[PDB]
């Protein structure tokens, strides 16, 4: 709960990073 709570915040914070990689590809080609 305590240390696991931060795990949820990181899950929604890291996800966008992956979306970015897909966002750069669209403009790359």
Q: Angle CA(17)–CA(29)–CA(26) in degrees, nearest 5? A: 35
**Which sign does the torsion angle of CA 8, 9, 10, 12 carry?**
positive
Residues in the chain: 29
Residue 3 to residue 10: CA distance in whole angstroms: 11
């Amino acid at each position: 709960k305590k240390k696991l709570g931060f795990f949820l915040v990181t899950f929604g914070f890291i996800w966008p990073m992956m979306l970015l990689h897909f966002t750069i590809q669209q403009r790359k080609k």
